[PDB]
Amino acid sequence: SQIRQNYSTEVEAAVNRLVNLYLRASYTYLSLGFYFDRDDVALEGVCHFFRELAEEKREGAERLLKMQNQRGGRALFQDLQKPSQDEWGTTLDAMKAAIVLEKSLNQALLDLHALGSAQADPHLCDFLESHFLDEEVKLIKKMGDHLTNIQRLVGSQAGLGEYLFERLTL
Amino acid sequence: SQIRQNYSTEVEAAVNRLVNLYLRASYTYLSLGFYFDRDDVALEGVCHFFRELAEEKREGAERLLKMQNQRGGRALFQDLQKPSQDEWGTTLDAMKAAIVLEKSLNQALLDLHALGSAQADPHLCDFLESHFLDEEVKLIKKMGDHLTNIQRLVGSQAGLGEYLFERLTL
Amino acid sequence: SQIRQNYSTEVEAAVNRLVNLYLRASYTYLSLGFYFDRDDVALEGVCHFFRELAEEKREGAERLLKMQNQRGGRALFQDLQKPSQDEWGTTLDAMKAAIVLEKSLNQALLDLHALGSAQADPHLCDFLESHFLDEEVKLIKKMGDHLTNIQRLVGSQAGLGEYLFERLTL
Amino acid sequence: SQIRQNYSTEVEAAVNRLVNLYLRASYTYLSLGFYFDRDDVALEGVCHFFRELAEEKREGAERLLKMQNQRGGRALFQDLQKPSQDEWGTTLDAMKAAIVLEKSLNQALLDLHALGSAQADPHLCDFLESHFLDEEVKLIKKMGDHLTNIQRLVGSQAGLGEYLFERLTL
């Protein structure tokens, strides 16, 4: 590339892996969203919560693909693996799986930042810090807030607590 | 009729039967609505839910009567049978009876579409597809959503769950 | 399902295959869009053309998933295969690959409509006719218009014609 | 200085060298801009492109001089060397010289960030990341986009392609 400057092949390969993780995450949140749209599940606020996260993960992947082109790297796309479950259980089981997914996206972002620091790439480190690291921490905190509230609700009787969390929080 | 073209007597008879089914349905939803307006029942959102459905079924019957006149067919009215119950029980029993009623209206719409396809009536098939088939599927989905939410609520204790569904959903 | 009525397992399986085809198509248009965003390609209007098509294919897949839930069918997601190429050549080669992709989506829509007609599913046939069949025909016509204009431009000298099509048409 | 804290003399000397590079760059873009304003060159959009870059490089140098005063360092000005050419050739030769100039400003910014990291100056590293590193990457990408478009245009016949790039892109 005629524009590539201080952009190693190891960072370029790791950004392509992170694009695949964000696209896989968006595919999982899509599956989560239409599960809660089922007539025998019927939790509309839970559906809208996961459908918003599917758009955010897809826009995070497009933000990385735009950065890859701005630095002169080449995007390589892989197969998107299907989500790990077909049925997602309750709102508690779904939010638990969503926070495991966000923590693994956060850990992959931290391994890219540590790779960009060892390779001495200050533009990559500022790009992750401006758009990706702070939004992951905020989302993991909000999901942990939801998990604490769901677990204090579904202690007594699960169906009443699951309905009230969807109505009054989401 | 001077305007009748490709409109068989079997379709005309079946449209008159479907007008009677939609008027009977509107009479049932009226009885459902004023049951939940009783002082010893007192579920105002359930009352307003069924009173809106009574207007929709009546406007569906008038839409079929307008189509019968546009095609040159003749409207024949029968006796409207009284609704199957005088008292409708709980919100769960009422929504269960409402989805049985909507599924039988949907099945009668599908038998009219299959009759219009065998008689090769493309205007009748487009009329049912534009105004009747899609609204039945949406209403049956919404009622199934309500039934799933009511049944997850009235598991613990019925009176608290019945009040909360009326307050927070309807 | 408590809401499923006149919705066969063969139509439900074929809708799940069509969701996968529309998601694969959206993945291909994403790869097409960021290829033309490369600094050594640098055709901004071609990039924006394919990025709009990636959103349309994704919204077409979500429209089918919403219909699958409204009819009481169950969404099953598969692996999204990666796009067939990593590099897409010129605007002529890209638009040729885009019209092959749209014609195969159109053919899969026609096989679903013929399956819904043999199974006598008039709601499925109206759903494809209202949202999917007419938009495919319009998009295939617009792509064929672009292919005729690109081929009359890149006859003389390819680079001048490729720049002028991006500037003045897209 | 009474305000100087964690600001080494090596960073202060390197910021003064970077002020001179940004002022030299602004002088080169001024010479580029008024070359394309000549009556025997007469490329008005190319003139306006380089005159905007002359203001951006001058405002980048004033932003560094403001930071030098905020940290308690002392600005030392050197002679501004005249630009390397008097005549700049075509738009292709000018954009090639402009991207060599921007890449050397980018490399000097990366050597200052690596010096601020070895000296453990986190305020200097955030200042370069917020205002300087991201704008250099965006400008180098835009110039590489222009170079790809100019080279695909001036392949056939140079004068027609040079006029069309100025009219339709700049």
XYZ file of C-alpha atoms in Angstrom:
680
model
C 0.000 0.000 0.000
C 1.121 3.550 -0.779
C -0.385 4.856 2.487
C 0.685 2.152 4.955
C 2.909 3.550 7.709
C 3.728 1.881 11.063
C 1.052 -0.782 10.584
C 2.386 -4.292 11.084
C 0.974 -7.471 9.589
C 0.324 -8.809 13.097
C -1.950 -5.873 13.929
C -3.656 -6.214 10.535
C -4.302 -9.917 11.147
C -5.583 -9.226 14.655
C -7.969 -6.525 13.419
C -9.393 -9.014 10.905
C -9.973 -11.485 13.740
C -11.727 -8.771 15.736
C -13.978 -7.918 12.786
C -15.048 -11.572 12.718
C -15.711 -11.550 16.472
C -17.860 -8.424 16.231
C -19.808 -9.836 13.250
C -20.252 -13.169 15.133
C -21.464 -11.177 18.196
C -23.998 -9.301 16.011
C -25.248 -12.639 14.677
C -25.695 -13.941 18.239
C -27.659 -10.861 19.332
C -29.885 -11.239 16.287
C -30.663 -14.819 17.314
C -31.268 -13.616 20.874
C -33.612 -10.879 19.684
C -35.883 -13.029 17.555
C -36.026 -15.703 20.245
C -37.714 -13.235 22.597
C -40.066 -12.246 19.757
C -41.515 -15.782 19.705
C -45.161 -16.080 20.704
C -44.377 -18.628 23.419
C -41.667 -16.350 24.840
C -43.184 -12.896 24.184
C -40.825 -10.558 26.050
C -40.893 -7.488 23.840
C -38.494 -5.311 25.827
C -35.944 -8.123 25.950
C -36.299 -8.465 22.169
C -35.663 -4.759 21.653
C -32.687 -4.823 24.035
C -30.854 -7.497 22.050
C -31.826 -6.077 18.660
C -30.179 -2.782 19.591
C -27.032 -4.657 20.589
C -27.001 -6.423 17.226
C -26.840 -3.064 15.460
C -24.105 -1.821 17.804
C -21.894 -4.856 17.209
C -22.374 -4.551 13.453
C -21.465 -0.863 13.542
C -18.438 -1.698 15.658
C -17.282 -4.116 12.977
C -17.779 -1.529 10.237
C -15.814 0.993 12.289
C -12.900 -1.454 12.409
C -13.153 -2.135 8.667
C -13.028 1.601 7.999
C -9.920 1.891 10.181
C -8.294 -1.055 8.384
C -8.728 0.761 5.067
C -7.498 4.098 6.461
C -4.260 2.451 7.579
C -3.725 0.617 4.298
C -4.508 -2.848 5.600
C -6.583 -5.394 3.728
C -9.850 -6.809 5.043
C -10.130 -10.602 4.967
C -13.521 -12.067 5.837
C -14.061 -15.540 7.265
C -17.119 -17.706 7.794
C -19.469 -16.421 10.465
C -20.092 -19.293 12.844
C -23.722 -19.739 13.868
C -24.651 -18.741 17.448
C -23.954 -21.262 20.187
C -27.618 -21.854 21.050
C -30.879 -22.068 19.149
C -33.045 -21.492 22.232
C -31.923 -19.063 24.900
C -33.976 -20.062 27.941
C -35.074 -17.281 30.256
C -34.076 -13.621 30.471
C -31.586 -14.621 33.173
C -29.925 -17.244 30.955
C -29.899 -14.846 28.004
C -28.328 -11.972 29.933
C -25.742 -14.370 31.367
C -24.792 -15.476 27.858
C -24.720 -11.854 26.701
C -22.239 -10.824 29.390
C -19.970 -13.793 28.581
C -20.017 -12.637 24.958
C -19.242 -9.005 25.829
C -16.404 -9.993 28.155
C -14.763 -12.010 25.389
C -15.071 -9.066 23.006
C -13.514 -6.911 25.718
C -10.661 -9.388 26.231
C -9.969 -9.470 22.489
C -9.885 -5.664 22.487
C -7.351 -5.739 25.322
C -5.155 -8.220 23.461
C -5.228 -5.935 20.420
C -4.261 -2.932 22.546
C -1.388 -4.873 24.103
C -0.315 -5.935 20.612
C -0.490 -2.341 19.407
C 1.600 -1.216 22.370
C 4.302 -3.839 21.821
C 4.395 -2.983 18.107
C 4.444 0.751 19.079
C 1.284 1.699 17.163
C -0.088 4.827 18.894
C -2.820 5.423 16.319
C -4.314 1.959 16.841
C -4.221 2.392 20.621
C -6.037 5.729 20.398
C -8.622 4.246 18.027
C -9.510 1.443 20.446
C -9.529 3.817 23.410
C -11.797 6.371 21.730
C -14.470 4.067 20.313
C -14.218 0.571 21.736
C -12.773 0.206 25.238
C -15.035 2.697 27.008
C -18.203 1.416 25.347
C -17.381 -2.164 26.327
C -16.918 -1.205 29.989
C -20.217 0.715 30.000
C -22.084 -2.174 28.379
C -20.634 -4.782 30.751
C -21.627 -2.592 33.714
C -25.182 -2.198 32.392
C -25.502 -5.948 31.822
C -24.237 -6.641 35.328
C -26.840 -4.197 36.620
C -29.536 -6.124 34.738
C -28.272 -9.473 36.065
C -28.402 -8.266 39.677
C -31.923 -6.937 39.182
C -33.149 -10.080 37.401
C -31.730 -12.349 40.100
C -33.342 -10.363 42.914
C -36.659 -10.570 41.024
C -36.794 -14.236 40.013
C -36.001 -15.446 43.512
C -39.618 -15.410 44.727
C -41.458 -16.635 41.632
C -39.823 -16.506 38.239
C -42.707 -15.626 35.925
C -43.878 -12.561 37.821
C -40.315 -11.285 38.176
C -39.507 -11.885 34.511
C -42.583 -9.930 33.408
C -41.900 -7.025 35.776
C -38.266 -6.622 34.687
C -39.325 -6.441 31.036
C -42.111 -3.950 31.785
C -40.376 -1.613 34.223
C -36.685 -1.745 33.231
C -36.618 -2.576 29.505
C -76.343 -7.593 -12.441
C -75.008 -5.376 -15.228
C -71.568 -5.171 -13.563
C -71.029 -8.789 -12.481
C -67.965 -10.321 -14.140
C -66.114 -13.496 -13.048
C -67.996 -13.660 -9.744
C -69.541 -17.062 -9.117
C -72.554 -17.801 -6.948
C -70.390 -20.015 -4.728
C -68.060 -17.122 -3.901
C -71.067 -14.840 -3.352
C -72.625 -17.348 -0.944
C -69.328 -17.808 0.883
C -68.845 -14.048 1.280
C -72.320 -13.825 2.836
C -71.346 -16.550 5.307
C -68.174 -14.640 6.152
C -70.145 -11.438 6.752
C -72.240 -13.360 9.285
C -69.114 -14.737 10.974
C -67.568 -11.280 11.283
C -70.825 -9.802 12.653
C -71.117 -12.756 15.110
C -67.464 -12.140 16.155
C -68.238 -8.433 16.755
C -71.207 -9.446 18.910
C -68.978 -11.772 20.958
C -66.351 -9.070 21.541
C -69.088 -6.692 22.649
C -70.234 -9.236 25.236
C -66.608 -9.733 26.282
C -66.067 -5.994 26.641
C -69.032 -5.253 28.870
C -68.294 -8.290 31.022
C -64.963 -6.753 32.033
C -66.767 -3.452 32.689
C -68.783 -5.094 35.491
C -68.119 -3.777 38.985
C -67.288 -7.244 40.311
C -64.838 -7.807 37.440
C -63.456 -4.271 36.945
C -60.603 -4.808 34.476
C -60.723 -1.604 32.469
C -57.861 -2.330 30.076
C -59.329 -5.735 29.254
C -62.657 -4.012 28.554
C -61.018 -1.542 26.184
C -59.078 -4.326 24.446
C -62.218 -6.257 23.518
C -64.238 -3.155 22.655
C -61.627 -2.200 20.066
C -61.846 -5.688 18.585
C -65.623 -5.360 18.334
C -65.213 -2.289 16.139
C -62.576 -4.015 13.998
C -64.764 -7.054 13.342
C -67.711 -4.823 12.460
C -65.579 -2.799 10.054
C -64.290 -6.023 8.542
C -67.864 -7.081 7.853
C -68.695 -3.729 6.262
C -65.584 -4.009 4.097
C -66.851 -7.358 2.803
C -70.336 -5.945 2.184
C -68.807 -3.104 0.181
C -66.835 -5.621 -1.889
C -69.971 -7.716 -2.462
C -71.710 -4.665 -3.932
C -68.692 -3.670 -6.051
C -68.684 -7.106 -7.676
C -72.430 -7.140 -8.292
C -73.282 -9.729 -5.668
C -76.257 -9.489 -3.345
C -75.953 -9.302 0.433
C -78.134 -11.750 2.365
C -78.228 -11.322 6.135
C -78.981 -14.109 8.597
C -79.749 -14.190 12.303
C -76.815 -13.261 14.501
C -76.443 -16.029 17.050
C -75.841 -14.835 20.604
C -72.312 -15.308 22.020
C -71.447 -18.722 23.414
C -71.060 -17.534 27.014
C -72.756 -15.014 29.264
C -69.875 -14.870 31.755
C -66.306 -15.043 30.527
C -64.339 -16.038 33.626
C -60.866 -14.588 33.990
C -58.646 -12.690 31.561
C -56.963 -16.009 30.750
C -60.268 -17.702 29.873
C -61.379 -14.670 27.866
C -58.174 -14.432 25.832
C -58.324 -18.182 25.192
C -61.854 -17.830 23.829
C -60.793 -14.811 21.774
C -57.987 -16.708 20.048
C -60.315 -19.633 19.247
C -62.677 -17.109 17.659
C -59.927 -15.415 15.628
C -58.549 -18.740 14.408
C -61.971 -19.745 13.104
C -62.305 -16.417 11.301
C -58.854 -17.038 9.846
C -59.810 -20.557 8.737
C -62.962 -19.244 7.054
C -60.839 -16.643 5.257
C -58.530 -19.405 4.032
C -61.459 -21.458 2.752
C -62.707 -18.410 0.850
C -59.267 -17.845 -0.674
C -59.060 -21.492 -1.726
C -62.550 -21.184 -3.207
C -61.544 -18.026 -5.056
C -58.458 -19.771 -6.416
C -60.378 -22.814 -7.657
C -62.983 -20.534 -9.254
C -60.092 -18.419 -10.692
C -61.152 -15.139 -9.059
C -57.970 -13.025 -8.800
C -59.773 -9.914 -7.566
C -61.272 -11.749 -4.586
C -57.894 -13.266 -3.709
C -56.216 -9.851 -3.768
C -59.011 -8.360 -1.654
C -58.567 -10.956 1.098
C -54.783 -10.681 0.940
C -54.752 -6.880 1.170
C -57.212 -6.360 4.023
C -57.982 -9.592 5.830
C -55.280 -12.271 5.853
C -52.420 -10.133 7.156
C -54.512 -8.517 9.884
C -55.697 -11.912 11.119
C -52.124 -13.210 11.411
C -51.041 -10.079 13.307
C -53.998 -10.309 15.687
C -53.485 -14.022 16.378
C -49.805 -13.344 17.118
C -50.680 -10.509 19.515
C -53.245 -12.674 21.310
C -50.725 -15.486 21.633
C -48.287 -12.969 23.098
C -50.923 -11.956 25.657
C -51.691 -15.594 26.522
C -48.020 -16.374 27.183
C -47.688 -13.295 29.379
C -50.920 -13.976 31.289
C -49.946 -17.590 31.951
C -46.503 -16.645 33.258
C -48.186 -14.093 35.555
C -51.070 -16.094 37.021
C -48.842 -19.004 37.973
C -47.813 -17.571 41.356
C -51.064 -15.970 42.508
C -53.808 -15.188 40.048
C -55.236 -11.919 41.360
C -51.951 -10.034 41.528
C -50.947 -11.261 38.073
C -54.323 -10.406 36.553
C -54.146 -6.851 37.905
C -50.561 -6.313 36.738
C -51.240 -7.509 33.180
C -54.169 -5.097 32.872
C -52.155 -2.195 34.304
C -48.829 -2.658 32.534
C -49.727 -4.301 29.200
C -53.283 -3.174 28.386
C -47.153 -23.395 18.563
C -50.513 -22.089 19.777
C -50.738 -19.637 16.847
C -49.559 -21.809 13.942
C -52.251 -22.193 11.277
C -51.749 -23.385 7.668
C -47.961 -23.134 7.931
C -46.213 -26.310 6.833
C -42.791 -27.492 7.938
C -41.593 -27.340 4.325
C -42.384 -23.625 4.089
C -40.786 -23.054 7.505
C -37.608 -24.841 6.401
C -37.532 -22.917 3.127
C -37.935 -19.571 4.906
C -34.957 -20.454 7.118
C -32.901 -21.177 3.997
C -33.944 -17.827 2.545
C -32.922 -16.014 5.734
C -29.461 -17.550 5.338
C -29.297 -16.484 1.682
C -30.242 -12.899 2.523
C -27.687 -12.761 5.379
C -25.002 -14.277 3.065
C -25.924 -11.639 0.418
C -25.564 -8.857 3.030
C -22.137 -10.239 3.942
C -21.103 -10.211 0.266
C -22.222 -6.599 -0.228
C -20.281 -5.607 2.874
C -17.139 -7.155 1.389
C -17.894 -5.406 -1.907
C -18.353 -2.062 -0.172
C -15.104 -2.033 1.767
C -13.172 -3.237 -1.269
C -14.096 -0.041 -3.114
C -13.119 1.950 -0.006
C -9.499 0.779 -0.375
C -6.964 3.490 -1.156
C -5.734 1.669 -4.262
C -9.317 1.286 -5.516
C -10.892 4.540 -4.258
C -14.322 4.526 -5.918
C -16.448 6.214 -3.283
C -19.791 6.084 -5.086
C -19.336 2.380 -5.794
C -18.592 1.874 -2.088
C -21.770 3.685 -1.078
C -23.823 1.747 -3.641
C -22.864 -1.638 -2.199
C -23.074 -0.495 1.421
C -26.700 0.503 0.874
C -27.402 -2.925 -0.600
C -25.862 -4.570 2.458
C -28.386 -2.807 4.680
C -31.265 -3.735 2.365
C -30.373 -7.430 2.356
C -30.038 -7.425 6.141
C -33.423 -5.743 6.532
C -34.908 -8.252 4.114
C -33.654 -11.063 6.327
C -35.099 -9.438 9.446
C -38.424 -9.009 7.656
C -38.483 -12.756 6.981
C -37.552 -13.550 10.590
C -40.411 -11.357 11.790
C -42.802 -13.198 9.467
C -41.515 -16.572 10.699
C -42.381 -15.571 14.268
C -45.797 -14.164 13.298
C -46.739 -17.497 11.733
C -45.481 -19.556 14.665
C -42.440 -20.986 12.925
C -39.039 -21.320 14.540
C -35.930 -19.562 13.257
C -32.876 -21.784 12.795
C -29.617 -20.030 11.953
C -26.739 -21.632 10.070
C -23.144 -20.626 9.438
C -22.764 -17.638 7.151
C -20.348 -18.652 4.424
C -17.715 -16.045 3.595
C -18.105 -14.180 0.272
C -16.839 -15.915 -2.849
C -14.061 -13.397 -3.538
C -11.646 -11.352 -1.472
C -10.878 -8.894 -4.281
C -13.623 -7.798 -6.635
C -11.735 -6.439 -9.643
C -13.275 -3.493 -11.445
C -16.704 -1.877 -11.188
C -17.755 -4.001 -14.171
C -16.706 -7.256 -12.478
C -18.336 -6.178 -9.217
C -21.662 -5.246 -10.806
C -21.632 -8.519 -12.748
C -21.179 -10.459 -9.512
C -23.884 -8.371 -7.845
C -26.461 -9.191 -10.515
C -25.643 -12.919 -10.307
C -26.241 -12.679 -6.559
C -29.548 -10.817 -6.939
C -30.809 -13.249 -9.572
C -30.169 -16.184 -7.250
C -32.031 -14.421 -4.445
C -34.856 -13.822 -6.911
C -34.879 -17.483 -7.975
C -35.017 -18.609 -4.341
C -37.947 -16.240 -3.787
C -39.731 -17.787 -6.768
C -39.164 -21.303 -5.445
C -40.637 -20.235 -2.104
C -43.680 -18.736 -3.827
C -44.191 -21.917 -5.843
C -43.853 -23.918 -2.628
C -46.372 -21.668 -0.898
C -48.784 -22.092 -3.799
C -48.527 -25.889 -3.826
C -48.984 -25.959 -0.042
C -51.902 -23.467 -0.458
C -50.429 -20.758 1.787
C -52.015 -17.469 0.631
C -50.510 -15.403 3.445
C -46.956 -16.410 2.524
C -47.598 -15.648 -1.149
C -48.920 -12.178 -0.316
C -45.955 -11.521 1.982
C -43.421 -12.286 -0.756
C -45.402 -10.320 -3.331
C -45.739 -7.222 -1.144
C -42.162 -6.883 0.097
C -39.781 -9.097 -1.836
C -40.683 -9.906 -5.444
C -41.210 -6.348 -6.673
C -38.066 -5.017 -5.006
C -35.963 -7.779 -6.555
C -37.235 -6.979 -10.058
C -36.536 -3.259 -9.564
C -33.028 -3.933 -8.261
C -32.162 -6.344 -11.083
C -33.370 -3.761 -13.618
C -31.260 -1.018 -12.013
C -28.182 -3.255 -11.980
C -28.718 -4.138 -15.626
C -28.955 -0.421 -16.367
C -25.615 0.107 -14.609
C -23.997 -2.790 -16.496
C -25.069 -1.391 -19.874
C -23.744 2.044 -18.951
C -20.450 0.702 -17.571
C -19.844 -1.422 -20.664
C -20.482 1.477 -23.040
C -18.036 3.572 -20.980
C -15.112 1.184 -20.510
C -14.949 0.327 -24.194
C -12.701 3.261 -25.142
C -10.369 3.414 -22.142
C -11.304 1.762 -18.886
C -9.932 4.162 -16.278
C -11.613 7.283 -17.620
C -14.922 5.459 -18.025
C -14.748 3.927 -14.552
C -14.146 7.336 -12.968
C -16.945 9.024 -14.924
C -19.545 6.377 -14.038
C -18.746 6.756 -10.336
C -18.862 10.561 -10.520
C -21.922 11.100 -12.702
C -24.161 8.084 -11.993
C -23.326 6.955 -8.443
C 9.270 27.543 34.888
C 6.915 27.544 37.875
C 4.403 25.323 36.029
C 6.709 22.763 34.392
C 5.978 19.227 35.595
C 7.092 15.960 33.923
C 8.219 17.763 30.766
C 11.752 16.846 29.751
C 14.128 18.968 27.705
C 14.236 16.246 25.042
C 10.475 16.460 24.495
C 10.678 20.268 24.493
C 13.423 20.196 21.854
C 11.494 17.682 19.759
C 8.316 19.780 19.890
C 10.308 22.775 18.622
C 11.562 20.661 15.715
C 7.993 19.613 14.949
C 6.821 23.236 14.963
C 9.467 23.962 12.322
C 8.352 20.970 10.240
C 4.712 22.059 10.340
C 5.635 25.664 9.424
C 7.892 24.366 6.582
C 4.972 22.156 5.395
C 2.629 25.191 5.407
C 5.183 27.101 3.332
C 5.345 24.234 0.817
C 1.552 24.065 0.463
C 1.469 27.814 -0.095
C 3.960 27.434 -2.945
C 1.898 24.533 -4.296
C -1.301 26.568 -4.136
C -0.077 29.609 -6.026
C 1.586 27.426 -8.646
C -1.816 26.043 -9.642
C -3.175 29.612 -9.681
C -0.811 30.498 -12.552
C -2.477 31.353 -15.850
C -0.492 28.705 -17.725
C -1.470 26.072 -15.142
C -5.007 27.217 -14.225
C -6.296 24.357 -12.062
C -8.499 26.200 -9.600
C -9.656 23.222 -7.540
C -6.071 22.032 -7.132
C -5.153 25.543 -5.962
C -7.925 25.536 -3.370
C -6.972 22.036 -2.197
C -3.402 23.035 -1.354
C -4.367 26.415 0.092
C -6.615 24.675 2.611
C -3.739 22.391 3.573
C -1.505 25.415 4.125
C -3.940 26.745 6.716
C -4.213 23.336 8.395
C -0.447 22.949 8.742
C -0.147 26.467 10.141
C -2.903 25.799 12.669
C -1.208 22.542 13.600
C 1.970 24.462 14.365
C 0.091 26.997 16.485
C -1.580 24.151 18.369
C 1.862 22.777 19.238
C 3.112 26.219 20.294
C 0.105 26.586 22.586
C 0.858 23.183 24.123
C 4.526 24.126 24.592
C 3.458 27.172 26.610
C 0.881 25.218 28.643
C 3.581 22.776 29.739
C 6.093 25.492 30.596
C 8.424 24.867 27.682
C 10.027 27.607 25.627
C 9.430 28.054 21.906
C 12.568 28.419 19.786
C 12.049 29.319 16.136
C 14.477 28.468 13.346
C 14.787 29.542 9.730
C 12.022 28.245 7.498
C 13.695 26.571 4.550
C 12.159 27.403 1.178
C 10.117 24.647 -0.526
C 12.034 22.017 -2.465
C 10.640 23.014 -5.869
C 9.691 26.237 -7.602
C 7.534 24.521 -10.234
C 5.420 21.536 -9.289
C 4.675 19.872 -12.626
C 1.290 18.231 -13.007
C -1.425 17.411 -10.480
C 0.037 13.900 -10.284
C 3.530 15.183 -9.445
C 2.103 17.664 -6.941
C -0.028 15.097 -5.117
C 2.942 12.719 -5.027
C 5.072 15.407 -3.392
C 2.241 16.233 -0.990
C 1.960 12.649 0.244
C 5.741 12.419 0.760
C 5.486 15.580 2.859
C 2.551 14.288 4.926
C 4.245 10.944 5.547
C 7.325 12.692 6.916
C 5.154 14.806 9.208
C 3.469 11.589 10.319
C 6.825 9.898 10.959
C 8.005 12.869 13.028
C 4.779 12.664 15.040
C 5.441 8.975 15.685
C 8.988 9.684 16.845
C 7.630 12.296 19.255
C 5.064 9.836 20.610
C 7.753 7.194 21.096
C 9.898 9.806 22.839
C 6.985 10.793 25.062
C 6.381 7.148 25.936
C 10.015 6.469 26.841
C 10.102 9.658 28.930
C 6.717 8.615 30.465
C 4.823 11.753 29.410
C 1.133 10.741 29.251
C -0.122 14.273 28.614
C 2.038 14.670 25.505
C 0.919 11.280 24.187
C -2.749 12.187 24.636
C -2.194 15.560 22.957
C -0.713 13.974 19.830
C -3.379 11.269 19.770
C -6.283 13.709 20.102
C -5.265 16.319 17.530
C -2.446 15.101 15.322
C -2.188 11.351 14.721
C -5.757 10.750 13.557
C -5.798 13.766 11.245
C -2.546 12.672 9.606
C -3.918 9.188 8.885
C -7.116 10.652 7.403
C -5.175 13.087 5.220
C -2.754 10.428 3.955
C -5.718 8.193 3.076
C -7.449 11.019 1.188
C -4.264 11.835 -0.728
C -3.809 8.182 -1.633
C -7.398 8.168 -2.872
C -6.617 11.182 -5.069
C -3.429 9.563 -6.407
C -5.282 6.392 -7.421
C -7.970 8.433 -9.157
C -5.478 10.718 -10.925
C -3.431 7.770 -12.177
C -6.480 5.968 -13.560
C -7.464 9.208 -15.335
C -4.172 10.322 -16.884
C -3.494 6.920 -18.402
C -5.477 7.558 -21.599
C -4.643 11.205 -22.280
C -3.276 13.413 -19.550
C -4.899 16.774 -20.266
C -8.476 15.524 -20.377
C -7.971 13.473 -17.216
C -6.310 16.344 -15.361
C -9.201 18.682 -16.184
C -11.867 16.149 -15.195
C -10.278 15.373 -11.815
C -10.167 19.079 -10.957
C -13.768 19.627 -12.078
C -15.468 16.559 -10.625
C -13.416 15.695 -7.517
C -11.891 18.979 -6.307
